[PDB]
C-alpha cells in the first residue's frame, strides 16, 4: 500500500518541479521589464494596484 503513496509523492514532486520552472522563468522575464519600467513608468502609471 505504501509504495503507491511513494509513487504519488513522485508525481507531486514532478508537479512541484514544473511549477518551479514556471516561476523561475516568470521572474527571469520580470527582471528586465522592471529594469526598463523604472524610468518613472512603474512609480504610479503602470502599477494600477487597484
Amino acid at each position: 500500500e505504501m509504495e503507491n503513496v511513494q509513487k504519488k509523492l513522485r508525481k507531486l514532486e514532478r508537479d512541484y518541479y514544473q511549477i518551479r520552472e514556471q516561476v523561475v522563468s516568470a521572474k527571469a522575464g520580470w527582471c528586465a521589464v522592471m529594469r526598463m519600467v523604472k524610468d518613472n513608468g512603474v512609480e504610479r502609471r503602470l502599477h494600477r494596484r487597484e
Binding site: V5, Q6, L9, L12
Partner: protein, 49 residues
Amino acid sequence: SHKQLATEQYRHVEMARELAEQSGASSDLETDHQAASDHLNLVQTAMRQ
C-alpha cells in the same frame, strides 16, 4: 508527506526486523519440538516393552 512516508518506511523496516527475529525463534522451537516428539516416541516404546 515525504517525511511521513520515509518515517513509515523506517517503522516498517523495524517491524520486518522483529518478525525476522520471531521467524528464527520459530525455527529453534521447531528443532526443540522435533526432539520432544522423538522423546515421546521413545517413552511410548519403553512403556510397551
